[PDB]
Each structure stands twice: as structure tokens, then as C-alpha cells.
Design a protein around this ligand. Sequence first.
Ligand code: ATP
Ligand code: ATP
Ligand code: MG
Ligand code: ZN
Ligand code: ZN
Lengths: 295, 296, 63, 77
Amino acid sequence: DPLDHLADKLFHSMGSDGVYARTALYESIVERLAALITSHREAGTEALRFPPVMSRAQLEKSGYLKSFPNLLGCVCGLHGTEREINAAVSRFDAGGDWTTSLSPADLVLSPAACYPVYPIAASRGPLPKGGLRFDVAADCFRREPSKHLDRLQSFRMREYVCIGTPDDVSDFRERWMVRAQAIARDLGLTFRVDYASDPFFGRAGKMLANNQRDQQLKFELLIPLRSEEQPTACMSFNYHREHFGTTWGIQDANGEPAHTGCVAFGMDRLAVAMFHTHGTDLSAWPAKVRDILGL
Amino acid sequence: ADPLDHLADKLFHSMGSDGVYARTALYESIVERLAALITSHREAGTEALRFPPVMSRAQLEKSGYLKSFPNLLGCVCGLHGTEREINAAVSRFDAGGDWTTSLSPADLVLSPAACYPVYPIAASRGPLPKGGLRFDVAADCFRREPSKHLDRLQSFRMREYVCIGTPDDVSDFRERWMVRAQAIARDLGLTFRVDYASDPFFGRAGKMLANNQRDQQLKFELLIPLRSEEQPTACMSFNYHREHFGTTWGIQDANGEPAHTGCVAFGMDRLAVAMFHTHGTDLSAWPAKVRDILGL
Amino acid sequence: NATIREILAKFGQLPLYAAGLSSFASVQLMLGIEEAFDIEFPDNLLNRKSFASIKAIEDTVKL
Amino acid sequence: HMNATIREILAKFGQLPTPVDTIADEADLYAAGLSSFASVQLMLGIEEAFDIEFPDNLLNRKSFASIKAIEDTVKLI
Ligand SMILES: Nc1ncnc2c1ncn2[C@@H]1O[C@H](COP(=O)(O)OP(=O)(O)OP(=O)(O)O)[C@@H](O)[C@H]1O
Ligand SMILES: Nc1ncnc2c1ncn2[C@@H]1O[C@H](COP(=O)(O)OP(=O)(O)OP(=O)(O)O)[C@@H](O)[C@H]1O
Ligand SMILES: [Mg+2]
Ligand SMILES: [Zn+2]
Ligand SMILES: [Zn+2]
């Protein structure tokens, strides 16, 4: 893996594949990329920042278990009484397994940044004409251990979300497909865009992925990191049609179930792509890129 | 009524769970300025690391967290079975049952405090140099403590400076930070007192640990009246661990003795709430000196 | 057709795309054709078009 | 006898380097081996081998500094 040699300057092991401590060098570029993305935020956008956990009930309601049950991280804890908890602990001291006393909380680790925004939008009543636009971010989690630097279990996501009529969303989508590519170009990155599909689970997941790709509901900006034949999706646009509008009872200004769409930036993938492309010595980065990033 | 409750309108949106909130732009802008202020006070020769919201469960077990706060720990679990098993769990959910009976533990927990992952990392470099090592660490932390009070969250940001070295390195470090942190609190126009305290150790065993900790003055807190002046909130802590983590991780100081460690911890969410409680939710009305201190 | 007039009623959740046959409904409809009959679709004929109408579903079965 | 029981527990939950046989009644336990987490198991061990429960007033380093202090504390309870 071509990326491996980047580890020494970017990451420290934390004893778990896909979970790394970030060096100051690495974080300085993550921060500049986030500032660049912010500088392209469109008018009328409301910014929200989500913690790394969210309501299990909200995620169940969003349909996540129908699509990616195998990817979800659930928060569990020792919920019993003092003796119950001490019993679990004692088993650990004894050389047994305390984890058998774990029971689920009402929380999961957020699998994507946008999920909490839909009930928040719904709570405000009908959408105004033109719809609503959100800027959301979260530390996300997906249970997919890997040693590859572009495949993490815990990673930062940044998203612009549009909630409105089908025309609102398609206008938003056309705009962000253009802007996402202009950003990658300004960063000096090599990419192509392709229609793609989410990693749906199961046999129904094969139909869902086929459907999604055939309908062109998901575009990805792909950057060669490991190789040119297996590039890495570093940005995406998802058109959800009326799926979340229906789920959450969001009505557009015409009284119809709202459509939603989002452009997603994988902050850790973009940072890794920058270092892979430009190296770990910032003073040598191309002058135009340094200027774009305010270096 | 909690004096803080009315802050929620401007700072937070509900996420359907006590102690877990979406953060507004106003709130985040202040968390960011506080973080930059803390960074500006960083000592020379301090290594900055940023940790994700999860860490190795094995490392946390080794750190002794189970013996001390087993009730606060959030573990990561997932559906690890076959496709048929996972599909059945989802089908039980559709039929009014509980899908979570198919969950099993992963090798990860949610990080309960920012400093834990730093000790193995320091340990991996061999013996400490003279003067020891200093780290600047941060993470989103989790503690299973549901509450409706805005100063008691389940998911919250912690920033810490950590010292690993001889007992003298560490005790001077903590003294330097105790003074520096109070000076910062005063610059921020905050009302506080500093007192000895103890971690919320669990059970009968814990009452003894808490007693000893308070008695040996291993932990100071800077306390700010938020809900009341009688039960003020700990917004910074100043912790001395003796050789507990140095022993656990086999860290050796420059004299070949098990290293001591300590840390100064800033509760970024508590500090932010404190600022808004103290000066209000209109930043233009904040005192000029405070605005200047924060670069507003 | 007699076997399909019960499958669409059980998993279709209609009030076929002009009706209330949604995506996640249609996949529970796909699975219901693998249950009432003894075959699993190929990834090729596994799609939106293969489940457009009632007469569309039937033809795919023979093939 | 209480002295001997207490001594046995100190081997049961002590993690001391030099055997309880080589430790005086008045000798300071932390001063030669008794750790924090150990002294807590010991306090639990004292509560196991007898059937008692210390007040929080005596739930501290002092009560477990020496075998004599332990014996005295248990008696005073
Ligand atoms: N494992 C990961 N590590 C780092 N960033 C990720 C990871 N998975 C997703 N992201 C980033 O966040 C976004 C998530 O959207 P999405 O659900 O489309 O994932 P994905 O890109 O389909 O998946 P995969 O590449 O894992 O098969 C992507 O644009 C990507 O940049
Ligand atoms: N539940 C919480 N919500 C928000 N911030 C917290 C919470 N717990 C701790 N913090 C903050 O982070 C720091 C954590 O260090 P520490 O482990 O010393 O916790 P603590 O001081 O035991 O707390 P407490 O009695 O308030 O639960 C605290 O100083 C505080 O500012
Ligand atoms: Mg993608
Ligand atoms: Zn999204
Ligand atoms: Zn700490």
C-alpha cells in the first residue's frame, strides 16, 4: 500500500486498525481543508455541529438497519446495581468476561453526519419557499477495521444538506457537483467523478445498490490513493428523493413530502489525499495550493 | 428552575437524548475561541495529539478504568454475526421485538477522558528524557451520566495538557498550570474558587479511593457557580497520578524509576456554558476586555 | 398471478410505481417472490424495471 | 487470633514483596509494599474474613498503615 509510508508523519497507533492519534501536522491540514470548505458555503446555510453519538431511536427510525446493520456501532454499558456491576468487574479480575453484562443504551455512534438534521428540520413545521440548507459535521463511525490509511473506523465527515422541493434539491445538486470538483482542482488533486452506490447489506442490498446506481442517485469524486484502478471516494453527492422527507414528515412549501440531498466531504480521506499527492513537507507544496489553503 | 436552562434556545438543539445536543454556530464559535486561547498558553516543547472519540478497550482495561468507573464506561458493540443472523435481528425489530440481543462487544470503547491513549504512546519511545515529556491532547469524551442540566453532558469535549516525568517535573508542571489557569479564568471574567476534590470512584472500594485522593490532594478543581453558588461546577481539573500510569505502562524517567504523570484538564463544553451563563448570549454585549482576550 | 396478488398485498404496502410501491417496499416484494417460489433473482434481473407492473413480475418468473 | 487472621488476609489481598511473616505489628505497610488499589482489596479482605463494614471516617490510609492500626481499628469497630 502506497499510503503506508505516510503513517509515520500523520498518525500514531492506538492499538486498533482504523483508529489513530492525529499529529499536529495532520490536524493542521484537516483544519485548513475545513476552512476552505466553509469558504464555499452557499447563502442562507445554517451550521450545526453534532457529537459523535446520536439517538438509537432516531437512527432506527431513519431506516439504517434496513441498509447497513453490519456497519453500526451501538453504545453499551454496565447498567445494573452495585453488586451486579461488581460481579461483572470481578469476572474480569478473575480472568473471565465482564462484557457479558453489557446492555444497550439509547445511543449509537453516528454513522453519518446528516441523520440528526432531519428531525431538527421537521420540528420547525413546513419548509419555507426555497427550502432549508444546512452545514453539518460529526465524527462518524463505521465498523470496518482495515490497515489502509483511507479506510478508518472513526473519521470526520462534513456535509452540506438541502431540504426542499425536487427542483430545490436538483439545483443544489448541480451546483455542488460543480463546486466539489472546483475545490478538488484548487487543491491540486487528480480525480474523476462517477455514479456509485452505498454499501447496502444483504440480498436486498444488491437490489438497492443496483437501483441506486441505475437511477444515478449517488455521485462520487474518486482519487487514486492506493492505485488508479481502485480509487478512493473522497467526496460524494447523495440524492435521497423523498425518503427522509417522508420518514420525518417534512413538508415542502407546496405541502408535499420534502426531497433531500447532500454533498459529503470525507475530511480524513481528503487530508490523506493531500499528503499522498503533495508530500509531508508543506513548504514544498505547490504555491497555488498553499495560497488556496492560506498557508 | 436551573438558571442554565434558558441558555438552550441559543446554544443547542435537541437530539432526542438527555446530555447529547446539536451545537449552534454561536455556541461553537465560543468553544473555538476558548480552544485557541488555551493553545496560546501552551508551553514550549509540548507535543500536540488529537484523539478520535473511541480508543482500544484493551488499553482502557489495562489503565484500570473498570476497577474505578465501570458504571461510566461506554463500550462499542455491533452486529458481528452471519448475514442470516443479522437479517433475523432486523426482522425481530420489524415485528416489535429487540434487535440489540444480537449485539456483541467490539474491541473499542468510547473514550472517557482525553489523556488515556497518550501513556502507551509515550511508553513506546523508551526512557523519558531529562525534564520528561509534555503533551497537548484533546478528544470528544463520553461518560454514561444522563442529565437534563446543560453542565452535565454525556458527550463532551476535553482538552488536556499532560506531563510525564519525575515527581518533581510533574508537581512543578501542575503548580505552573494551577496559577496559569486561574489567571485565564480571571481574564475571561469568570467567578470561581479552586478546591481539592476527588474522582467519582464507584462503590464501597471507591469511597476509600476518593478519601485518599482528597487527603493526598491529588486533584484540584476550578469551580464556577452555574446552577448555584452552593453546588458550583468543576470546569478545570488539576490531577496528579503519582506513578500509577507510569507503572501500568512501564514508563521510565531519566533516572530509571517508574515515571510519574499528571494533567490539567479543561472541560470545553462546561467552560463555554460558563461564558454564556456569565456574560449572556449576545457577544457584542460581552465586556470589551473579555472580547479582546478571546479575539472577538 | 394468484401467488402475486397476495405477495404485493403483504409486503408492497400500497394505498406499481404510480401506486405506493416504494424502494424498501419493492425489495421486500423481491424477497417475497423468492419465498412464494423457489428461486433467487440474478443480479442482472434484480432491479427497478423487473418490478414495474404486475404483468412485469410474472414474466420474469418464467425466465 | 484476630492478629493472625488479619495477617492471613494481608497475604490474601496484599501483593507485598516480603511475606507477612517478615512484617511487624507496628511497621508501616505502605512504607514497604502496600499499594493503593491493594489496600482497598485488603480493606475488602478484612470485611470478608470478618463480617464488618468500616465507617467512612476510617475509610483511609491511616486505618491500614500497620497491622496494629488495622487490629485496633477493627476492635474499635
Ligand atoms: N471508512 C472510511 N474512512 C474514511 N472516510 C470515510 C469512510 N467511509 C466513508 N468516508 C467518507 O465519508 C463519506 C461517506 O459517504 P458514504 O457512505 O458514501 O461512504 P462510501 O464512500 O460509500 O464507502 P466505502 O468506500 O467504505 O465502500 C465518503 O464521501 C468518504 O469520503
Ligand atoms: N458530564 C460532563 N459534562 C461536561 N463536561 C464534563 C463532564 N464531566 C467532566 N467534564 C469536564 O471535563 C473535566 C473532566 O475531568 P474530570 O475527570 O476531572 O471530571 P470530574 O471533574 O470528575 O467531574 P463531575 O463531578 O463534574 O462529574 C472536568 O473538569 C469538567 O470540566
Ligand atoms: Mg463515497
Ligand atoms: Zn448526508
Ligand atoms: Zn487527564
